[PDB]
């Protein structure tokens, strides 16, 4: 019914290197579909994204990801609004 | 320029309840993030709480959690952070802090306070 989402990080966190924050989104009827990434729960501005949809039961999978180097204490966290949502989901980050 | 407007506190018994309030006037497209913090006698301060300039993400200090909690107002002008079940070792002085979202998003979200815009600061007194 509404999307299901996933906040992860391409590798284990290490702190002062370099790896890669991702928000996968998937379910159906995406044309209206709006995902941000949030770092101290204001929108990252350079993000990018790949997207996967079917017509035939209107599925779509949608990536989202930016490249991050993590802190002891920056928190991080994924936006989504859809239709079905009466108001947007977040998605913390956790470890 | 940026005028805070922060207000709510004072005296309650324990176990009450109090809500205090920010808003500032003066922001680009009035939007901005926000936190608070309090001043304790005899403490360092402590960080409480702080809410995006979207306002959908709260973060909260364990020691608040499930006690304090942010809310907005009809006309979504003023931001309110209720504070339930209150206790003697919540007696401080509270003071919001906001800053533009561009600055508030490398700014940590529990403790940082590299906010460049501040309340005076309301004084809360729980007695028991």
């Known amino acids: 019914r509404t999307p299901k989402i996933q906040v992860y990080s391409r590798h284990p966190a290490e702190n002062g290197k370099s790896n890669f924050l991702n928000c996968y989104v998937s379910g159906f009827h995406g044309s209206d579909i709006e995902v941000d990434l949030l770092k101290n729960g204001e929108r990252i501005e350079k993000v990018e994204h790949s997207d996967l949809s079917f017509s035939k039961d209107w599925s779509f999978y949608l990536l989202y990801y930016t490249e991050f180097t993590p802190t002891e204490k920056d928190e991080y966290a994924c936006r989504v609004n859809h239709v079905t949502l009466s108001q947007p989901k977040i998605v913390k980050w956790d470890r | 320029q940026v005028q805070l407007q922060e207000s709510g506190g004072g005296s309650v018994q324990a176990g009450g309840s109090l809500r205090l309030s920010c808003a500032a006037s003066?922001?680009?497209?009035?939007?901005?993030?926000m936190a608070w913090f309090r001043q304790a006698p005899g403490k360092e301060r402590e960080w409480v709480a702080r809410?995006?300039?979207?306002?959908?993400?709260?973060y909260y200090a364990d020691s608040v959690k499930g006690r304090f909690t942010f809310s907005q107002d009809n006309a979504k002008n003023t931001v309110y952070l209720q504070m339930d079940s209150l206790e003697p070792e919540d007696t401080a002085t509270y003071y919001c802090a906001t800053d533009i979202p561009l600055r508030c998003r490398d700014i940590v979200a529990k403790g940082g306070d590299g906010f460049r815009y501040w309340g005076q600061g309301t004084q809360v007194t729980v007695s028991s």
């Open positions: 809410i995006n300039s979207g306002r959908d993400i709260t």
């Open positions: 003066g922001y680009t497209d009035s939007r901005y993030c």
